[PDB]
Amino acid sequence: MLQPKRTKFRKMHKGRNRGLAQGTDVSFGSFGLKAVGRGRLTARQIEAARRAMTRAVKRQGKIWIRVFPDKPITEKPLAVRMGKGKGNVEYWVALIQPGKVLYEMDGVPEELAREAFKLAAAKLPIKTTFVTKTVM
Amino acid sequence: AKTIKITQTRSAIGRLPKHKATLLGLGLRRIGHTVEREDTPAIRGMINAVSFMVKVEE
Amino acid sequence: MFTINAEVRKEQGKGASRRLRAANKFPAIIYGGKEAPLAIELDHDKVMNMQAKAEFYSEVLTIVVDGKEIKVKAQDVQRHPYKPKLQHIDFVRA
Amino acid sequence: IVISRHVAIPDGELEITAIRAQGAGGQHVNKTSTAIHLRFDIRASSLPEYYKERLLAASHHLISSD
Amino acid sequence: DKKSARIRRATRARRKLQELGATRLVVHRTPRHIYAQVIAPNGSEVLVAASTVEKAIAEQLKYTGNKDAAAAVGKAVAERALEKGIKDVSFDRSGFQYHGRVQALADAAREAGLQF
Amino acid sequence: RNGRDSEAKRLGVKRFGGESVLAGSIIVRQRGTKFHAGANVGCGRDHTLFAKADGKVKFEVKGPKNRKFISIEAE
RNA sequence: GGUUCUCCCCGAAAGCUAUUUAGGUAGCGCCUCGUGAAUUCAUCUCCGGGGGUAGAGCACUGUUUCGGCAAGGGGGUCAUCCCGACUUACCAACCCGAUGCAAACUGCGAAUACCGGAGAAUGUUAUCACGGGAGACACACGGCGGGUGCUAACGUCCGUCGUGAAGAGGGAAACAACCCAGACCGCCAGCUAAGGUCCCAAAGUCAUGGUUAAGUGGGAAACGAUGUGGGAAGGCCCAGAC
RNA sequence: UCCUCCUAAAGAGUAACGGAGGAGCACGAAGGUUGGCUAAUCCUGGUCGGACAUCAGGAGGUUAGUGCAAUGGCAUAAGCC
RNA sequence: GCUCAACGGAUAAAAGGUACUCCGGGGAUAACAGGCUGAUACCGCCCAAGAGUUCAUAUCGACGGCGGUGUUUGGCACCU
RNA sequence: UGCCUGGCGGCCGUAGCGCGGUGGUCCCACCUGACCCCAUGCCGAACUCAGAAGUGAAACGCCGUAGCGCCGAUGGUAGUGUGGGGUCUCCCCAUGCGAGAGUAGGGAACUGCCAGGCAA
């Protein structure tokens, strides 16, 4: 479970996921998996994606993860009167602005990479596209 | 600053406090009401304030 | 080398830009030396096919504007977030 | 999951039904006091040979002949 | 170094005296030489000045840089101040510790009738 | 285990650059030292800025560190 | 719980503070009547201002991925007791470099809003003060900015505005709180607003060029698909391709 | 009950059984004034001392300190003597 | 000279039970049902390694994702 | 007027550092001594006094240098006041305002008051 160690506050405000992403290009890898929609990405959904995706490359090349949850979602226990403080920390999730580059890879065949990311999209709750690290 | 014709084209019910205060500043009371003033940037600003609901003729 | 028949921008601004960006065209800019920077307007589609080559950011390009062909160079580019499109391209007069 | 010491025992083999209780206590206890669970863990599924054998051959209630 | 050190000490009273609209009495001491002058409440221009660079007192003294040297020119600067009739004077320790020549300097000024 | 806010101590500035005031007129109620008396202004014990002389307020900022000052243009 | 004739004029609030106070009450804000004092006050333009939120950013507070350097340390060669030395199936952070994030982070920094001043037009003098009488101190909803909740609720809690509250009429089939628009009265008069114009039912079976075959329109997504239309480029192409 | 920050939407102000911490003192000096001074943290050398004792140089630059929580602030020091 | 800390402090001084309870009120506020919602529950679907004789698409199908119903417990208190 | 030196203001990070060069008839710094004024919670370091042979290295100032710090267009982009609309957990249209970052380039200053040295 990708999770923030040594944090300052335990719970934070929900905020709004407006605006557009900053990490628009593929820095590390040669190809990227840039997202289309606007949504949330839990730590579990990252594991479902990456682990299932790394099997496609078959232990070849390196996978660069360009995201981190760093935001705790608190939910109330079942059968609880509405009110009386915020709920307990349930998990972690990252806020993704459209056009965000999520994964990077290199030392991998184009079509294998094209297919590996296809499998990754299945576990991801956000629409995405296959992009490559373009020159300049 | 010659004469300038200003007319009201919409209501003042669902309007902003500033807009309401501005509309009475122009003197326009009822809808379709006409009025005459002197063309100056001060008035032009007010004209620009409620342009969405005002028909202006020179 | 790549000849670009671009038009001088009539008006700059946020509204005008998106207005012509909907018209399959997008704005650009040029500068370099003591000369005055000029607001350049051109197509996006065909130019999109031009920048597909890596040599597009190394070649001393030639943008012809109403007879006046300027030898320019591609400094930097501003793209669209997710859709494979362009926003604006910086052109250094070379 | 209804987690057992080693084998997790994933829910789907443990049928959970909500019925009404039995007793006294007013309006709540006679009608709406549901969630009175009736578990049903068949040994035909998981709970490996060592577990299920002592739950099918053993003489005890809360566990049936099947 | 030494300069900046003396500056951080001087700025203290100088700011206070800058906002009081009075003629501040600034002095500048060196091992062999001494300077003295008054400043207008504005801090832009000066009114009078006297130092060891002036022949009028340099010839009269034995050595430029000792107690008596400041005592002589101290009277000199106070006299042209007396010539200008200016009395609203406020002394400035100017970072220099008040005990050496600067001490003897203020005396001749005070003997002339300077209000401070 | 929470919800124990103290009070809104009515901080902030009172006057602005371009307003004529009288002697004793408080300019700003700053807690720290976000400003400093340039001239004709007094820095209270709470480092609050009050006008010692009548006139108009003018905001300035000087020095390499550039800490904002306040003086009074005699009026 | 109830509180009986008539007409004319104006016209609230459901907030703040304290309360053995929380369906009460008191002061204040907001209503009204009379009076006294100012181009007083309101809208716009220009001028002089402070703010740091949005956004952005990552030097500081924390947090994030990876790599070059590289030593602290360790499995070993063994010091077969303490010194010494290499290596490093490694953590690879710290220095150096590249990359994201933050209500309680800020080397930056809007739009609005707010204060003061100058000037013109306009407004029933709408500002302020004094005095008489108040009611009210349970608010709802829509939009926008947010807390909480499941970015659930005709949920709840604040800021701000509108509406209802205390406003009918037209439209949304029906529909306080949505869109339009403020009922002094009469008229078998005309023009329009939102919204609509085959019939029920008043108004174009209007005009022009495209699009869909599903009654789509007329409940709904991830995802799948030789459904089809428009657009650019390219592979290839009568030395003959599918 | 009171104090700090956030929530708070860049004036003030603004709720929640909303999100995190504190106070019910201390001081005759830790106050006033006059004078002087002003770091933290790394690199290195050195007796027991080896990662830190303390001293000495350079770098560095205010992350120091400020009776106590936080916030704003302070070297012209409100910091230290 | 009173942690008059329930801190604008009802008197120096003041704890509980009522299922025989009584009265005045309230859906301004609970229990049942109805309503809104759909966390939970149930139902369907996308993806898929492995088990499965071969083979994931014979069958299950975890890890995760997207919807539907309103029969589960709930949330909310709009009706009484 | 200038090369200047010294004291005092205004414009401010373009106004501050790094590297090399460069100045002393004057001035300044260093430098000499200190029973005695004065000084060290020890020490003439600092401070003060009495003088000043020597030096121009350190220090200070000037010149070149952007090598940096740093400043910073133009355009675009984000956001947003107002009026509408939408597939209204967010965006779009008309309209006005308009960042931060980043790019080109630039950027190591300018000016004033008083007192003397130097050649007129």
From Swiss-Prot, chain A:
Pfam families: Ribosomal_L16. SUPFAM superfamilies: Ribosomal protein L16p/L10e (SSF54686). The modification (3R)-3-hydroxyarginine is found at residue 81. One of its GO terms (molecular function) is rRNA binding. One of its GO terms (biological process) is cytoplasmic translation. It comes from the Bacteria. The keyword Metal-binding does not apply. Binds directly to 23S ribosomal RNA and is located at the A site of the peptidyltransferase center. It contacts the A and P site tRNAs. One of the last ribosomal proteins to be assembled in the 50S subunit. The simultaneous presence of uL16 and bL36 probably triggers ObgE's GTPase activity and eventual dissociation from the mature 50S ribosmal subunit. It has an essential role in subunit assembly. PANTHER family: 50S/60S RIBOSOMAL PROTEIN L16, LARGE RIBOSOMAL SUBUNIT PROTEIN UL16M. This is Large ribosomal subunit protein uL16. It comes from Escherichia coli (strain K12). The lineage of its organism: Bacteria, Pseudomonadati, Pseudomonadota, Gammaproteobacteria, Enterobacterales. The gene is rplP.
Curated annotation (Swiss-Prot), chain B:
Keywords: Ribonucleoprotein, Ribosomal protein. GO terms for biological process: cytoplasmic translation; ribosomal large subunit assembly. The keyword Ribonucleoprotein applies. It holds the Pfam family Ribosomal_L30. GO terms for molecular function: structural constituent of ribosome. PROSITE patterns: RIBOSOMAL_L30 (PS00634). GO terms for cellular component: cytoplasm; cytosolic large ribosomal subunit. SUPFAM superfamilies: Ribosomal protein L30p/L7e (SSF55129). NCBIfam families: rpmD_bact. Part of the 50S ribosomal subunit. This protein is located near the guanosine triphosphatase center of the 50S subunit. Belongs to the universal ribosomal protein uL30 family. This is Large ribosomal subunit protein uL30. It comes from Escherichia coli (strain K12).
From Swiss-Prot, chain D:
Changing residue 26 to A: Decrease in activity. It is found in: Cytoplasm. Belongs to the prokaryotic/mitochondrial release factor family. Rescues stalled ribosomes. Can hydrolyze peptidyl-tRNA on ribosomes stalled by both non-stop mRNAs and mRNAs that contain rare codon clusters or ribosomes stalled in the middle of mRNA. First identified as a complementary ribosome rescue system when the stalled ribosome cannot be rescued by the SsrA(tmRNA)-SmpB quality control system or the alternative ribosome-rescue factor A (arfA). This is Peptidyl-tRNA hydrolase ArfB. It comes from Escherichia coli (strain K12). The unstructured C-terminal region is required for ribosome binding and peptidyl-tRNA hydrolase activity. The C-terminal tail functions as a sensor to discriminate between stalled and actively translating ribosomes by binding in the mRNA entry channel downstream of the A site between the head and shoulder of the 30S subunit. This allows the N-terminal globular domain to sample different conformations, so that its conserved GGQ motif is optimally positioned in the peptidyltransferase center (PTC) to catalyze the hydrolysis of peptidyl-tRNA. Associated with 70S ribosomes and polysomes.
UniProtKB/Swiss-Prot annotation, chain E:
GO terms for molecular function: 5S rRNA binding; structural constituent of ribosome. One of its GO terms (cellular component) is cytosolic large ribosomal subunit. Signal peptide: none annotated. Keywords: Phosphoprotein, Ribonucleoprotein, Ribosomal protein, RNA-binding, rRNA-binding. The protein has been shown to contain a phosphoserine, which was required for the protein to bind to 5S rRNA. However, the presence of this phosphoserine is controversial, and it has not been seen by mass spectrometry. It comes from the Bacteria. This is one of the proteins that mediates the attachment of the 5S rRNA subcomplex onto the large ribosomal subunit where it forms part of the central protuberance. Binds stably to 5S rRNA; increases binding abilities of L5 in a cooperative fashion; both proteins together confer 23S rRNA binding. The 5S rRNA and some of its associated proteins might help stabilize positioning of ribosome-bound tRNAs. The basic N-terminus is not necessary for binding to 5S rRNA. It is however required for cooperative binding of L5 and L18 to 5S rRNA as well as for binding of the 5S rRNA/L5/L18 complex to the 23S rRNA. Belongs to the universal ribosomal protein uL18 family. Part of the 50S ribosomal subunit; part of the 5S rRNA/L5/L18/L25 subcomplex. Contacts the 5S and 23S rRNAs. This is Large ribosomal subunit protein uL18. The gene is rplR.
